[PDB]
Amino acid sequence: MHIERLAVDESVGRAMPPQRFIEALSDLGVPVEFAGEDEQFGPGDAVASFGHRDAFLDADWVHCIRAGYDEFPVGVYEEAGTYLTNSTGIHGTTVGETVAGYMLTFARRLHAYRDAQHDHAWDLPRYEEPFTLAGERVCVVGLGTLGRGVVDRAAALGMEVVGVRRSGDPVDNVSTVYTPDRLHEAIADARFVVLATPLTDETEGMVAAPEFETMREDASLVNVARGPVVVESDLVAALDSGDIAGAALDVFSEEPLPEDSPLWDFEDVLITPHVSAATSKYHEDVAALIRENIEKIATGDELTNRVV
Amino acid sequence: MHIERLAVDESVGRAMPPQRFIEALSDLGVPVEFAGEDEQFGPGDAVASFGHRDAFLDADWVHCIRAGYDEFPVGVYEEAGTYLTNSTGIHGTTVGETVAGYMLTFARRLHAYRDAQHDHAWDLPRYEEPFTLAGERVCVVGLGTLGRGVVDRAAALGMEVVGVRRSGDPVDNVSTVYTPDRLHEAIADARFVVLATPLTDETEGMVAAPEFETMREDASLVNVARGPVVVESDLVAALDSGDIAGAALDVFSEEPLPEDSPLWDFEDVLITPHVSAATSKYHEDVAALIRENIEKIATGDELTNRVV
Ligand SMILES: NC(=O)c1ccc[n+]([C@@H]2O[C@H](COP(=O)([O-])OP(=O)(O)OC[C@H]3O[C@@H](n4cnc5c(N)ncnc54)[C@H](OP(=O)(O)O)[C@@H]3O)[C@@H](O)[C@H]2O)c1
Ligand SMILES: NC(=O)c1ccc[n+]([C@@H]2O[C@H](COP(=O)([O-])OP(=O)(O)OC[C@H]3O[C@@H](n4cnc5c(N)ncnc54)[C@H](OP(=O)(O)O)[C@@H]3O)[C@@H](O)[C@H]2O)c1
Ligand SMILES: [Mg+2]
Ligand SMILES: [Mg+2]
Ligand SMILES: [Mg+2]
Ligand SMILES: [Mg+2]
Ligand SMILES: [Mg+2]
Ligand SMILES: [Mg+2]
Ligand SMILES: [Mg+2]
Ligand SMILES: [Mg+2]
Ligand SMILES: [Mg+2]
Ligand SMILES: [Mg+2]
Ligand SMILES: [Mg+2]
Ligand SMILES: [Mg+2]
Ligand SMILES: [Mg+2]
Ligand SMILES: [Mg+2]
Ligand SMILES: [Mg+2]
Ligand SMILES: [Mg+2]
Ligand SMILES: [Mg+2]
Ligand SMILES: [Mg+2]
Ligand SMILES: [Mg+2]
Ligand SMILES: [Mg+2]
Ligand SMILES: [Mg+2]
């Protein structure tokens, strides 16, 4: 490909101010231009976007500004000869930190204290409530950029770490790596189970009633992956019945999470609005990927994070 | 020194259920007895207590179950020939985790999300709000058990770490160690300033209006030491004026914090009720210290954590 222009779809506004991103790419060597909803594309065009538009199939290359590309019609890009790349590789620090934050919140009871802060109440925990992450077990399901960001911070905090990935291959700081057919073994003894997989045919509904049964009654589920990896109604039922203790949830089967979801109301559920990867430098972090792939295109190298 | 008995002052209940502590000490090899507020003491008596009682001055040895002994008349113990020990050395993991939790809460905006959760509101942060601890600077004031617990976790999360202590001597994971006369130099460029000193003559009112002026306007104060290390009214004024961004506060000039304190109402203040060191295993942690010193007393060895 010969790229002559980078179009910035308005949908990037869902994660970052489009003008900040445009400005980050001012010395890219092609012009970088805001594109509205009904923009048309053609030869020489690269497009950066949150989601898919059929108009993009006229372009040479679409870069999805998310790691997750499950909302893109991948087979159609192949057909059209349009390259598609994603933003995997940039969310390890942000998500890793958020997840460390969730686990420390539960161990140290920070969320209960925040609730009491609204009441101006000096409410002391029950003696058995506060604990330390040091010496506790975490199972990280998915061991890529997100999962490793979680693993490394968990290990540094003194946690025991196991995990699950497709290949079963070793991962630094993970004591035992399981394949997905051994999910129950992986999750059974864990104080925290963290979900960091893409949404695929295989992962959809992976965590359901039987998994909540297997999990320790004192355990918490963390979902920073995609909502439908979990059977959300089963999660509610598990929380109600005490099959698990709680959950930190950044992603949901329907987003925004509807007001009537029971999930909002559990004391030991943390709801976050799909922001575990949020950062005031997202524009720069995505721009780096674009610059990298422009240089790879320019020199005939294989594209980074090429989906199809 | 012949220790014939260990009295467990009822005040230990302020930190842990006394029966759990008593049972933890069943192996001690002297009798272990509960002591009410009017008990009298004599030769061969050891006392485990939260607070001071003049009655203890007839005992041989008092073990304070807290790290902070600022509420004990140390000069009086010396005159009376009563040994005083404290519980420093056991709070590094708990407080270190809590402080990591505070910092991650602020970086990842978890407290704001929790507030929104009460209202079933899917409220996205402002773009500029979320950040990462990785690459940010923390200044830890006090580099003992608490300070090192903080330092080690901050460094492992990728923070730049400087600090302040009395002696100026090197501390692992602290890039620059300042003496207390260089406090302003130490705090000026820090995103987080953590207080982990005892309450002493020198530390009382250490952090006041001029320190808040010096601090970055985007910085947060963390106090896990003692309330009076900070001039609390100056903290309120600094928060109101935007001289600093916020604070995580576990300790206060008056505890419980009065309901009418302005500190409750700042979005970017976390109030916790003197629980940064709370743990369901505190009884075991303190019992270990008692066991160690019982032995050391019996054998004429130097006591652990001897104050006077
Ligand atoms: N804001 C957010 O909440 C946020 C942000 C970024 C990403 N995400 C989500 O997180 C997903 C992962 O992102 P990433 O950048 O970490 O992707 P990545 O680096 O490609 O890693 C994906 C990991 O998932 C593993 N995996 C795939 N199928 C699996 C299965 N059936 N069971 C267990 N593990 C499986 C892969 O295994 P192998 O390594 O063996 O192939 C790999 O370790 C994205 O697709 C997106 O949905 C969410
Ligand atoms: N629940 C809670 O919030 C909680 C729990 C435990 C303790 N605490 C409080 O935290 C305090 C510290 O406990 P710890 O176990 O860490 O004590 P520690 O191990 O004795 O350490 C005290 C540290 O403070 C330093 N220090 C003393 N005066 C100072 C000054 N003027 N400026 C800067 N640094 C100074 C000392 O310096 P040198 O090492 O150079 O002498 C030492 O590094 C306790 O006294 C207590 O008040 C609070
Ligand atoms: Mg409660
Ligand atoms: Mg622990
Ligand atoms: Mg892969
Ligand atoms: Mg392995
Ligand atoms: Mg690695
Ligand atoms: Mg279960
Ligand atoms: Mg089962
Ligand atoms: Mg509600
Ligand atoms: Mg950062
Ligand atoms: Mg010392
Ligand atoms: Mg010296
Ligand atoms: Mg060390
Ligand atoms: Mg070192
Ligand atoms: Mg002074
Ligand atoms: Mg002075
Ligand atoms: Mg001063
Ligand atoms: Mg200032
Ligand atoms: Mg502000
Ligand atoms: Mg209020
Ligand atoms: Mg608010
Ligand atoms: Mg000596």
Numbering used by the authors:
A (entry chain B), B (entry chain A): 1 to 308
From the primary publication:
Here we describe the molecular basis of the reaction mechanism and dual NADH/NADPH-specificity of D2HDH, a 2-hydroxyacid dehydrogenase from the extreme halophile Haloferax mediterranei, an organism whose proteins have to remain active in high intracellular concentrations of KCl. Sequence analysis has identified D2HDH as a member of the DDH clade of the D-isomer specific 2-hydroxyacid dehydrogenase enzyme family (2HADH), which has potential applications in the synthesis of chiral fine chemicals including alcohols, and hydroxy or amino acids from ketones or ketoacids. Structural studies have shown that all members of this family share a common fold based on two domains, which cycle between open and closed conformational states that serve to close the inter-domain cleft, bringing the substrates together during catalysis. The D2HDH dimer has an overall ellipsoidal appearance in which each monomer is folded into two domains (d1; residues 1–92 and 283–308 and d2; residues 93–282).
Interestingly, the structures of the D2HDH complexes determined in this study have shown that, dependent upon the crystallisation conditions used, the 2-ketoacid substrate can be trapped in the crystal structure in two different orientations, representing a catalytic or abortive mode of binding. In both the productive and abortive modes of substrate binding the 2-ketohexanoic acid alkyl side chain occupies a similar position in the active site, but is twisted as a result of a 120° rotation to the C2-C3 torsion angle.
